[PDB]
């Protein structure tokens, strides 16, 4: 049975703004990439399926429990201990006045961790995992660069080894080397720990290397979906063809 | 075991007035365990299109592509994406000219990964990857380095080793030896022969006459 | 003579945080790319050379006038009428409580525009230039997606046809199609109007297609510089080699 | 006019233990206006390395690469990146197998752009681009469409047309006709002949014997 099941999900701020009639499944150890036009409803959908925006229509089932039929307490418990959420703007997923170490350790303590030294050591290890120097642990995120904030948010949302991570453009602000580090980290987590990921991205290379399936969104509607390689290499919808044709081609020397 | 029945595929180019580009027309094919069938035709005939359809990378517009997943018959043209993903994980293997890997991973780990994903112990995967890399005469100094830092031939050999790390019952090959020299091409041919001996249904595209003659057991005309 | 001249420029928050001893020239009708590790000092340098951060050492000359020896009034006049600045976080370059039309029209009115209808028409034309529907003119940026905010910021900073535009990761949050639209727009402005651009980017494809020269920054130091194609295809510094090797390779069908 | 004197180029691979990979050793070469010199050697000899050094895409470790920019001699190995940029704008032209353009721009505009950057009137640029595209038998239906939506041969022909839009005094060619058929290769050879007739110093890399014999005026051995 699917870890997450989305049926006829709809949320529209206005006639065209948001998403309408979105359905998909997700299982453990799988990545659902979401690509499409800027302003197509990807962030809105990610919020809705991550218990942050009540849909107007449709249902979300997590482990065969309707997401928005649950109590608010249960949803917050899921978002504290079970799920991870990486926001498009990194600071939206961080505590500005809390050090990086504290930002990471909040999640660990939410899972019952109560040893300060172990929490700090894990935070430093995860800072080194995302190539943030461990000597920045006590610095506030406001002193971090955009990419550093992004990586801190990722580390904060991955430290508890969640069963399901929603990510909005996680590679934003990352250099290609640290981007590759992050892709390897996520792939390893998915394959080993059976982590499931829903990743919104505009980098079709990241989608190709990471996403097991893809959803192409235009004007709030999923216009194409299926195997990532099939969608990117054999697009059927005109918009998907335009998107793949707009990719910046590289050359091999 | 492979059974392709009446697979037709037109490409629609919406970016240019939506012109239709027929490629495969009611293509039919059958492959037995331990048998190798090589697609034969001119450039643009549709060899790669058919081979990619067999791998589910392309979606035939009409027809059936039945494969023996374990002891079940699965039609790729209608199978859910999850089923195709697991089929690729265990049943159907693919080898081509381009290595698509996460950049900063070493070649040894790149080769090991497909077998590790199957749950095989890490030591066994490392031993098999080292065996395969040695067979394709890839220097040991390059094993712990990222493939992107190597030459084209070394990268292609690493790609082939990654392709042969898992004993896929069904194997698909697209010009694996095109950029390889005589010795490397011979090693790849030996690997293909060994895979065929163990009971692998192999579908390949080869341009070298010698390689095709050495490896091919049946010829599939792609002209129609 | 160079439109902008940077000599021995240094600004360090701490020993390693920021940039140190940076020198380069820029001329009209040219694009200086800045690439490098996240947290290498690119945003700090861009702020310093754009009259937003006083350097500790070195000099910046604009049209043969020292930038920070000028009065604050002159620097603000440059940033109002002469220059454009695109921030890494789009909202930092936008007025949250001002409509998109107002965000664009502020710059026009700063250049002496005083016809409301013409200002609104130009704002709509530039919204269509960045593929934002013209019917979003009266909506606040808070209702915009991240990429929409990015494009609104770009339109706001390009509407006055500035002689010099500093951009921090302008392609962040943009789909590949609208990214290509933006690249064509910037290239056309540079070639026709002789616009000069200093663009920080992590997308080496954008740098290759847009930048005439590159600076590569590591830990606050320019470790390599020169012709874009030479830097990307014949890197000498180990970090540049690592960066180019980390690029996600694509395939042609 | 081209004068390459003692250009040596080793590649240092820091990503793999910093191993040195010598390619060019005190390479010397000279090209006259209206003369075509073709580099000759085996794969990996360093033909592309030398050709890219002539275009400043590679930076020779030692040596001089002097070109006649207008009525001045400019050494690419030491020229400021700004001088090289203007040299490419006016003096040195490059044609290769891969078209690097902004995606969503039409082929006609792609071909026109190098000449437009020189200030030539738009109508003249459009007429010349149409002439070049017709000569390379590129269908008119594709002129107002982005090159990325075409086939490899059409994209390469558009790249060649973009290369020949400006009458560069110095021209560099890297396998322009490799993927082209007989008629397209003949058209490219005719374009090269016309460019040579007007007084273009051409340096080329060709693998086809017929094309090299038709076009080449002198042979430069790249084995040493
Ligand atoms: N994804 C695609 N989109 C559009 N057209 C395609 C696509 N894949 C293939 N084609 C076109 O369909 C036809 C089939 O080409 P294909 O690559 O299958 O030929 P081939 O010579 O047999 O291949 P290969 O040389 O890889 O063995 C050609 O016109 C090719 O341009
Ligand atoms: N940018 C580079 N970085 C590292 N090694 C390189 C680079 N460019 C070339 N080489 C290597 O230097 C040697 C020169 O190869 P090159 O491409 O010049 O040969 P070629 O056969 O003459 O070229 P072409 O087939 O393009 O005419 C080869 O070993 C190549 O791998
Ligand atoms: N609070 C809001 N009020 C009104 N419209 C909104 C609001 N938030 C987002 N939108 C609109 O909904 C659409 C979807 O936005 P979003 O999901 O963020 O796009 P993207 O897929 O680019 O993330 C956009 O066109 C945006 O303008
Ligand atoms: N206000 C600040 N106080 C202390 N350190 C800072 C501050 N702002 C930035 N830094 C540090 O300076 C370095 C350069 O940051 P920045 O220029 O934003 O990097 P990037 O090149 O990724 O944009 C980073 O390592 C960052 O942690
Ligand atoms: Mg978004
Ligand atoms: Mg093909
Ligand atoms: Mg920055
Ligand atoms: Mg070469």
Author numbering:
A (entry chain J), C (entry chain I): 3 to 255
B (entry chain L), D (entry chain K): 1 to 224
Provide passages from the article that reported this PDB entry:
To capture potential, additional conformational states of the complex resulting from the ATPase activity in PhnK and PhnL, we next purified wild type Phn(GHIJKL)2 complex in the presence of ATP and EDTA (to initially prevent ATP hydrolysis by PhnK), then added excess Mg2+ to initiate the reaction immediately before spotting onto cryo-EM grids and plunge freezing. Cryo-EM data collection and processing under these conditions yielded structures of several functional states including a high-resolution structure of the Phn(GHIJKL)2 complex extending to 1.9 Å using a final set of 222,056 particles and by imposing C2 symmetry. This state is essentially identical to the structure determined in the presence of AMPPNP, however, close inspection of the PhnK active site in the high-resolution EM map revealed that it contains ADP and Pi and consequently represents a true ATP post-hydrolysis state. We also observe binding of ATP to both nucleotide binding sites in PhnL, but despite this, the dimer is still in an open, ADP-like state. Structure determination under ATP turnover conditions allowed us to capture a closed, post-hydrolysis structure for PhnK as bound to the core complex and ADP + Pi. For the ABC transporters, this conformation is difficult to capture due to fast release of Pi and energy upon ATP hydrolysis, so this result might suggest that PhnL serves to control phosphate release from PhnK and therefore potentially also provides an explanation for the requirement for two types of ABC modules. As hypothesised above, PhnL could potentially function to inhibit Pi release from PhnK post hydrolysis and thus control when the energy generated from ATP hydrolysis is released, likely to break open the core complex as shown. The EM density suggests that the C-terminal region of PhnK becomes more ordered in the presence of PhnL.
In Escherichia coli, the 14-cistron phn operon encoding carbon-phosphorus lyase allows for utilisation of phosphorus from a wide range of stable phosphonate compounds containing a C-P bond. The crystal structure of a core enzyme complex, Phn(GHIJ)2, revealed a symmetrical hetero-octamer consisting of a compact, central tetramer of the PhnI and PhnG subunits each interacting individually with the more distal PhnJ and PhnH subunits. Here, we show using single-particle cryogenic electron microscopy that PhnJ mediates binding of a double dimer of the ATP-binding cassette proteins, PhnK and PhnL, to the core complex. ATP hydrolysis induces drastic structural remodelling leading to opening of the core complex and reconfiguration of a metal-binding and putative active site located at the interface between the PhnI and PhnJ subunits.
